[PDB]
């Protein structure tokens, strides 16, 4: 049958123009008292999925 998308991943990740995966940062839910403004400013921005992880998860988002 058709390969199923990993739906959890489809809600976290997004494919860029060159085929990288855009992601949000962790540590962006709560406990902002315990993180510096510099940390919070940087965690606010988007990031890329790393090479090692992309290898592991690439096929889970194949249909996207």
């Amino acid at each position: 049958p058709k390969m199923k998308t990993h739906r959890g991943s489809a809600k976290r990740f997004k494919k860029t123009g060159s085929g990288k995966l855009k992601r949000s940062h962790a540590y962006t839910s709560h406990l902002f008292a315990n993180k510096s403004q510099k940390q919070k400013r940087k965690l606010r921005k988007s990031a890329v999925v790393s090479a090692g992880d992309f290898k592991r998860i690439k096929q889970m988002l194949a249909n996207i």
């Binding site: 976290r12 949000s24 962790a26 839910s29 592991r56 889970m60």
Partner: peptide, 16 residues
């Protein structure tokens, strides 16, 4: 699956 290490997708927040 990462052998029980919290998987990447699950460590990161849902967006949008």
């Amino acid at each position: 699956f990462e052998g029980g290490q919290m998987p990447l997708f699950q460590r990161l927040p849902k967006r949008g």
